[PDB]
Assembly symmetry: C2
Homo-oligomer: 148 residues x 2
Amino acid sequence: SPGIWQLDCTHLEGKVILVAVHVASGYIEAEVIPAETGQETAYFLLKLAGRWPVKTVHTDNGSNFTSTTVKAACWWAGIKQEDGIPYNPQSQGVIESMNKELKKIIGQVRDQAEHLKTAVQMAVFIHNHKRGYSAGERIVDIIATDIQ
Amino acid sequence: SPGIWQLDCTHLEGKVILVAVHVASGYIEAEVIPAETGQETAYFLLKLAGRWPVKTVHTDNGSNFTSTTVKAACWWAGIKQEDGIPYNPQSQGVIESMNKELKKIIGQVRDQAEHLKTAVQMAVFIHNHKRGYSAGERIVDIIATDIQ
Ligand SMILES: CC(C)C[C@H](CNC(=O)Cc1c[nH]c2ccccc12)Cc1ccc2c(c1C(=O)O)OCO2
Ligand SMILES: CC(C)C[C@H](CNC(=O)Cc1c[nH]c2ccccc12)Cc1ccc2c(c1C(=O)O)OCO2
Protein backbone atom coordinates (compact mmCIF):
# COMPACT_ATOMS: atom_id res chain seq x y z
CA SER A 1 0.00 0.00 0.00
CA PRO A 2 2.74 2.71 0.05
CA GLY A 3 2.16 3.37 -3.69
CA ILE A 4 -1.67 3.53 -3.65
CA TRP A 5 -3.50 6.80 -4.35
CA GLN A 6 -7.21 7.65 -4.75
CA LEU A 7 -8.62 10.42 -6.95
CA ASP A 8 -11.49 12.51 -5.63
CA CYS A 9 -13.38 15.30 -7.36
CA THR A 10 -15.47 17.75 -5.33
CA HIS A 11 -17.24 21.03 -6.19
CA LEU A 12 -17.26 24.52 -4.66
CA GLU A 13 -18.08 28.07 -5.92
CA GLY A 14 -19.13 26.68 -9.31
CA LYS A 15 -15.62 25.26 -9.66
CA VAL A 16 -13.98 21.86 -9.51
CA ILE A 17 -11.42 20.71 -6.93
CA LEU A 18 -9.41 17.65 -7.92
CA VAL A 19 -7.80 15.79 -5.02
CA ALA A 20 -5.36 12.90 -4.81
CA VAL A 21 -5.26 11.11 -1.45
CA HIS A 22 -2.46 8.79 -0.39
CA VAL A 23 -4.71 6.12 1.09
CA ALA A 24 -2.39 4.78 3.81
CA SER A 25 -1.51 8.23 5.29
CA GLY A 26 -4.34 10.64 4.43
CA TYR A 27 -1.82 12.98 2.75
CA ILE A 28 -3.29 14.99 -0.13
CA GLU A 29 -2.44 17.10 -3.13
CA ALA A 30 -5.15 19.20 -4.77
CA GLU A 31 -5.82 21.69 -7.53
CA VAL A 32 -8.69 23.82 -8.79
CA ILE A 33 -9.62 23.19 -12.43
CA PRO A 34 -12.40 24.74 -14.56
CA ALA A 35 -13.90 21.29 -15.23
CA GLU A 36 -12.97 17.65 -14.75
CA THR A 37 -11.79 16.57 -18.19
CA GLY A 38 -9.54 13.61 -19.06
CA GLN A 39 -6.91 16.14 -20.06
CA GLU A 40 -6.89 17.94 -16.69
CA THR A 41 -6.92 14.64 -14.80
CA ALA A 42 -4.04 13.32 -16.91
CA TYR A 43 -1.94 16.44 -16.29
CA PHE A 44 -2.66 16.26 -12.54
CA LEU A 45 -1.48 12.64 -12.45
CA LEU A 46 1.73 13.48 -14.33
CA LYS A 47 2.47 16.14 -11.70
CA LEU A 48 1.66 13.78 -8.83
CA ALA A 49 3.78 10.91 -10.13
CA GLY A 50 6.81 13.17 -10.60
CA ARG A 51 6.57 14.16 -6.92
CA TRP A 52 5.68 10.87 -5.12
CA PRO A 53 6.20 7.19 -6.08
CA VAL A 54 2.73 6.54 -7.46
CA LYS A 55 2.23 2.84 -8.25
CA THR A 56 -1.55 2.52 -8.36
CA VAL A 57 -4.35 5.05 -8.81
CA HIS A 58 -7.98 4.36 -7.98
CA THR A 59 -9.75 6.64 -10.45
CA ASP A 60 -12.70 8.70 -9.27
CA ASN A 61 -15.18 7.84 -12.02
CA GLY A 62 -15.75 5.89 -15.22
CA SER A 63 -15.10 8.77 -17.58
CA ASN A 64 -11.58 9.20 -16.22
CA PHE A 65 -11.09 5.42 -16.11
CA THR A 66 -12.01 5.29 -19.82
CA SER A 67 -10.19 8.47 -20.95
CA THR A 68 -7.45 7.77 -23.50
CA THR A 69 -5.47 10.79 -22.22
CA VAL A 70 -5.64 9.49 -18.65
CA LYS A 71 -4.55 6.06 -19.90
CA ALA A 72 -1.67 7.70 -21.80
CA ALA A 73 -0.50 9.54 -18.68
CA CYS A 74 -0.70 6.39 -16.57
CA TRP A 75 1.31 4.54 -19.21
CA TRP A 76 3.89 7.34 -19.39
CA ALA A 77 4.30 7.59 -15.61
CA GLY A 78 4.25 3.81 -14.89
CA ILE A 79 0.96 3.95 -12.98
CA LYS A 80 -1.48 1.05 -12.77
CA GLN A 81 -4.93 2.51 -13.32
CA GLU A 82 -7.72 0.85 -11.32
CA ASP A 83 -11.37 1.55 -10.63
CA GLY A 84 -12.39 3.39 -7.46
CA ILE A 85 -15.35 1.17 -6.57
CA PRO A 86 -15.87 1.11 -2.78
CA TYR A 87 -15.91 -2.68 -2.27
CA ASN A 88 -15.34 -1.79 1.38
CA PRO A 89 -18.24 0.70 1.84
CA GLN A 90 -16.32 2.62 4.54
CA SER A 91 -14.22 3.91 1.60
CA GLN A 92 -16.89 6.39 0.43
CA GLY A 93 -17.59 7.67 3.96
CA VAL A 94 -13.90 8.48 4.53
CA ILE A 95 -13.67 10.44 1.25
CA GLU A 96 -17.04 12.11 1.85
CA SER A 97 -15.83 13.20 5.31
CA MET A 98 -12.55 14.53 3.89
CA ASN A 99 -14.40 16.64 1.30
CA LYS A 100 -16.53 18.17 4.07
CA GLU A 101 -13.40 18.73 6.20
CA LEU A 102 -11.56 20.35 3.26
CA LYS A 103 -14.52 22.61 2.50
CA LYS A 104 -14.66 23.65 6.17
CA ILE A 105 -10.99 24.66 6.10
CA ILE A 106 -11.53 26.52 2.83
CA GLY A 107 -14.30 28.52 4.53
CA GLN A 108 -11.99 29.32 7.45
CA VAL A 109 -9.26 30.71 5.16
CA ARG A 110 -11.45 31.90 2.29
CA ASP A 111 -11.21 35.44 3.72
CA GLN A 112 -7.38 35.44 3.58
CA ALA A 113 -7.25 34.64 -0.13
CA GLU A 114 -8.66 36.55 -3.09
CA HIS A 115 -8.81 33.41 -5.26
CA LEU A 116 -10.25 29.94 -4.56
CA LYS A 117 -7.11 28.20 -5.81
CA THR A 118 -5.11 29.93 -3.06
CA ALA A 119 -7.63 28.91 -0.39
CA VAL A 120 -7.44 25.32 -1.64
CA GLN A 121 -3.64 25.30 -1.29
CA MET A 122 -3.98 26.74 2.24
CA ALA A 123 -6.42 23.91 2.98
CA VAL A 124 -3.94 21.34 1.60
CA PHE A 125 -1.30 22.83 3.92
CA ILE A 126 -3.53 22.74 7.01
CA HIS A 127 -4.78 19.23 6.19
CA ASN A 128 -1.28 17.78 5.72
CA HIS A 129 0.16 19.46 8.84
CA LYS A 130 -2.74 18.67 11.22
CA ARG A 131 -1.59 16.47 14.11
CA GLY A 132 0.21 11.63 17.26
CA TYR A 133 1.44 12.34 13.74
CA SER A 134 0.48 14.44 10.73
CA ALA A 135 -0.39 13.10 7.29
CA GLY A 136 2.87 14.61 6.01
CA GLU A 137 4.82 12.69 8.63
CA ARG A 138 2.93 9.45 7.93
CA ILE A 139 3.51 9.47 4.17
CA VAL A 140 7.27 10.11 4.55
CA ASP A 141 7.58 7.35 7.18
CA ILE A 142 5.54 4.88 5.13
CA ILE A 143 7.54 5.47 1.95
CA ALA A 144 10.93 5.51 3.73
CA THR A 145 10.15 2.16 5.40
CA ASP A 146 9.21 0.74 1.97
CA ILE A 147 12.40 2.00 0.26
CA GLN A 148 14.45 0.09 2.85
CA SER B 1 19.41 20.85 6.33
CA PRO B 2 16.30 18.70 5.72
CA GLY B 3 14.07 21.81 5.56
CA ILE B 4 16.20 23.93 3.18
CA TRP B 5 14.97 24.75 -0.34
CA GLN B 6 16.36 26.97 -3.10
CA LEU B 7 14.32 28.85 -5.70
CA ASP B 8 15.56 28.95 -9.29
CA CYS B 9 14.04 30.74 -12.27
CA THR B 10 15.03 29.74 -15.81
CA HIS B 11 13.68 30.63 -19.27
CA LEU B 12 12.59 28.61 -22.32
CA GLU B 13 10.30 29.22 -25.36
CA GLY B 14 9.69 32.82 -24.24
CA LYS B 15 8.29 31.43 -21.00
CA VAL B 16 9.38 31.20 -17.39
CA ILE B 17 10.08 27.98 -15.46
CA LEU B 18 10.09 28.35 -11.69
CA VAL B 19 11.92 25.59 -9.82
CA ALA B 20 12.29 24.72 -6.14
CA VAL B 21 15.23 22.45 -5.30
CA HIS B 22 15.57 20.57 -2.03
CA VAL B 23 19.26 21.33 -1.54
CA ALA B 24 20.28 18.18 0.37
CA SER B 25 18.68 15.69 -2.10
CA GLY B 26 18.43 17.40 -5.51
CA TYR B 27 14.67 16.74 -5.54
CA ILE B 28 12.67 19.36 -7.45
CA GLU B 29 9.22 20.73 -8.04
CA ALA B 30 8.61 23.07 -10.99
CA GLU B 31 5.96 25.03 -12.82
CA VAL B 32 5.65 27.15 -15.95
CA ILE B 33 4.40 30.70 -15.31
CA PRO B 34 3.86 33.58 -17.77
CA ALA B 35 6.30 35.79 -15.81
CA GLU B 36 8.11 35.75 -12.50
CA THR B 37 6.03 38.03 -10.30
CA GLY B 38 5.90 38.15 -6.49
CA GLN B 39 2.36 36.83 -6.74
CA GLU B 40 3.31 33.74 -8.78
CA THR B 41 6.32 33.05 -6.55
CA ALA B 42 4.18 33.39 -3.42
CA TYR B 43 1.56 30.96 -4.77
CA PHE B 44 4.28 28.47 -5.76
CA LEU B 45 5.73 28.59 -2.23
CA LEU B 46 2.30 28.03 -0.65
CA LYS B 47 1.90 24.91 -2.81
CA LEU B 48 5.40 23.67 -1.97
CA ALA B 49 5.05 24.18 1.79
CA GLY B 50 1.74 22.28 1.88
CA ARG B 51 3.48 19.29 0.28
CA TRP B 52 6.93 19.15 2.00
CA PRO B 53 8.16 20.49 5.38
CA VAL B 54 9.71 23.71 4.11
CA LYS B 55 11.64 25.49 6.87
CA THR B 56 13.94 27.81 4.93
CA VAL B 57 13.84 29.16 1.39
CA HIS B 58 16.80 30.73 -0.37
CA THR B 59 15.07 33.14 -2.74
CA ASP B 60 16.28 33.41 -6.32
CA ASN B 61 16.58 37.19 -6.59
CA GLY B 62 16.14 40.50 -4.79
CA SER B 63 12.73 41.29 -6.23
CA ASN B 64 11.27 38.11 -4.75
CA PHE B 65 13.20 38.66 -1.50
CA THR B 66 11.62 42.13 -1.24
CA SER B 67 8.11 41.23 -2.47
CA THR B 68 5.42 41.84 0.17
CA THR B 69 3.32 38.98 -1.28
CA VAL B 70 6.26 36.58 -1.03
CA LYS B 71 6.86 37.75 2.54
CA ALA B 72 3.15 37.21 3.30
CA ALA B 73 3.26 33.66 1.95
CA CYS B 74 6.41 32.87 3.92
CA TRP B 75 4.75 34.24 7.06
CA TRP B 76 1.58 32.24 6.40
CA ALA B 77 3.43 28.97 5.74
CA GLY B 78 6.02 29.34 8.55
CA ILE B 79 8.96 29.68 6.15
CA LYS B 80 12.14 31.59 6.96
CA GLN B 81 12.98 33.63 3.89
CA GLU B 82 16.68 34.05 3.17
CA ASP B 83 18.79 35.42 0.34
CA GLY B 84 20.19 33.07 -2.31
CA ILE B 85 23.68 34.58 -2.46
CA PRO B 86 26.24 31.91 -3.42
CA TYR B 87 28.72 32.42 -0.56
CA ASN B 88 30.03 29.02 -1.60
CA PRO B 89 30.55 29.71 -5.34
CA GLN B 90 29.94 26.03 -6.24
CA SER B 91 26.27 26.86 -5.48
CA GLN B 92 25.73 28.71 -8.80
CA GLY B 93 27.45 26.01 -10.85
CA VAL B 94 25.21 23.28 -9.43
CA ILE B 95 22.03 25.27 -10.23
CA GLU B 96 23.37 26.31 -13.64
CA SER B 97 24.08 22.64 -14.42
CA MET B 98 20.60 21.58 -13.27
CA ASN B 99 18.95 24.16 -15.55
CA LYS B 100 20.94 22.82 -18.52
CA GLU B 101 20.05 19.24 -17.52
CA LEU B 102 16.35 20.12 -17.17
CA LYS B 103 16.33 21.87 -20.54
CA LYS B 104 17.97 18.82 -22.14
CA ILE B 105 15.25 16.54 -20.76
CA ILE B 106 12.58 18.97 -21.92
CA GLY B 107 14.02 18.74 -25.45
CA GLN B 108 13.97 14.94 -25.27
CA VAL B 109 10.25 14.86 -24.33
CA ARG B 110 9.14 18.08 -26.01
CA ASP B 111 7.82 15.98 -28.92
CA GLN B 112 5.54 13.91 -26.63
CA ALA B 113 3.74 16.93 -25.23
CA GLU B 114 1.73 19.62 -27.00
CA HIS B 115 2.33 22.16 -24.21
CA LEU B 116 5.55 23.25 -22.48
CA LYS B 117 4.00 22.85 -19.01
CA THR B 118 3.49 19.14 -19.72
CA ALA B 119 7.08 18.72 -20.91
CA VAL B 120 8.28 20.45 -17.74
CA GLN B 121 6.32 18.02 -15.55
CA MET B 122 7.76 15.08 -17.55
CA ALA B 123 11.21 16.57 -16.89
CA VAL B 124 10.45 16.86 -13.16
CA PHE B 125 9.44 13.18 -13.21
CA ILE B 126 12.59 12.04 -15.03
CA HIS B 127 14.82 14.23 -12.85
CA ASN B 128 13.37 12.95 -9.56
CA HIS B 129 13.41 9.28 -10.61
CA LYS B 130 16.93 9.24 -12.16
CA ARG B 131 19.24 6.83 -10.33
CA GLY B 132 22.87 4.53 -5.96
CA TYR B 133 19.63 6.37 -5.15
CA SER B 134 17.21 8.78 -6.84
CA ALA B 135 16.44 12.31 -5.65
CA GLY B 136 12.96 11.11 -4.68
CA GLU B 137 14.49 8.40 -2.51
CA ARG B 138 17.00 10.80 -0.95
CA ILE B 139 14.44 13.42 0.09
CA VAL B 140 12.14 10.82 1.71
CA ASP B 141 15.08 9.23 3.57
CA ILE B 142 16.46 12.60 4.71
CA ILE B 143 13.10 13.82 6.03
CA ALA B 144 12.18 10.48 7.65
CA THR B 145 15.51 10.40 9.51
CA ASP B 146 14.87 13.97 10.72
CA ILE B 147 11.31 13.21 11.94
CA GLN B 148 12.71 10.43 14.16
C1 LIG C 1 -0.28 34.61 1.60
C2 LIG C 1 -1.68 35.15 1.78
C3 LIG C 1 -1.97 35.41 3.25
C4 LIG C 1 -1.92 36.45 1.01
C5 LIG C 1 -1.70 36.38 -0.49
C6 LIG C 1 -2.11 37.72 -1.09
N1 LIG C 1 -3.52 37.99 -0.95
C7 LIG C 1 -3.98 38.98 -0.11
O1 LIG C 1 -3.32 39.93 0.31
C8 LIG C 1 -5.41 38.79 0.30
C9 LIG C 1 -6.38 39.44 -0.59
C10 LIG C 1 -6.14 40.27 -1.67
N2 LIG C 1 -7.35 40.63 -2.20
C11 LIG C 1 -8.36 40.06 -1.48
C12 LIG C 1 -9.72 40.16 -1.67
C13 LIG C 1 -10.51 39.47 -0.78
C14 LIG C 1 -9.96 38.72 0.23
C15 LIG C 1 -8.60 38.62 0.41
C16 LIG C 1 -7.79 39.31 -0.48
C17 LIG C 1 -2.53 35.27 -1.10
C18 LIG C 1 -2.24 34.99 -2.55
C19 LIG C 1 -0.92 34.73 -2.89
C20 LIG C 1 -0.55 34.44 -4.18
C21 LIG C 1 -1.54 34.39 -5.13
C22 LIG C 1 -2.83 34.63 -4.80
C23 LIG C 1 -3.23 34.93 -3.52
C24 LIG C 1 -4.68 35.18 -3.27
O2 LIG C 1 -4.97 36.21 -2.60
O3 LIG C 1 -5.51 34.38 -3.78
O4 LIG C 1 -3.65 34.53 -5.88
C25 LIG C 1 -2.74 33.93 -6.82
O5 LIG C 1 -1.37 34.10 -6.46
C1 LIG D 1 0.81 11.65 -21.46
C2 LIG D 1 1.41 12.18 -22.74
C3 LIG D 1 2.31 11.14 -23.39
C4 LIG D 1 0.35 12.58 -23.76
C5 LIG D 1 -0.62 13.65 -23.29
C6 LIG D 1 -1.51 14.04 -24.46
N1 LIG D 1 -0.76 14.64 -25.54
C7 LIG D 1 -0.62 13.99 -26.75
O1 LIG D 1 -1.33 13.08 -27.17
C8 LIG D 1 0.53 14.51 -27.55
C9 LIG D 1 0.16 15.64 -28.42
C10 LIG D 1 -1.10 16.16 -28.65
N2 LIG D 1 -0.97 17.21 -29.52
C11 LIG D 1 0.35 17.38 -29.84
C12 LIG D 1 0.92 18.32 -30.67
C13 LIG D 1 2.29 18.26 -30.81
C14 LIG D 1 3.03 17.31 -30.15
C15 LIG D 1 2.45 16.37 -29.32
C16 LIG D 1 1.07 16.42 -29.17
C17 LIG D 1 0.12 14.87 -22.78
C18 LIG D 1 -0.73 15.91 -22.12
C19 LIG D 1 -1.55 15.48 -21.08
C20 LIG D 1 -2.36 16.35 -20.39
C21 LIG D 1 -2.33 17.67 -20.76
C22 LIG D 1 -1.53 18.09 -21.78
C23 LIG D 1 -0.71 17.25 -22.49
C24 LIG D 1 0.11 17.82 -23.58
O2 LIG D 1 0.10 17.22 -24.69
O3 LIG D 1 0.74 18.89 -23.34
O4 LIG D 1 -1.65 19.43 -21.97
C25 LIG D 1 -2.35 19.79 -20.77
O5 LIG D 1 -3.04 18.69 -20.20
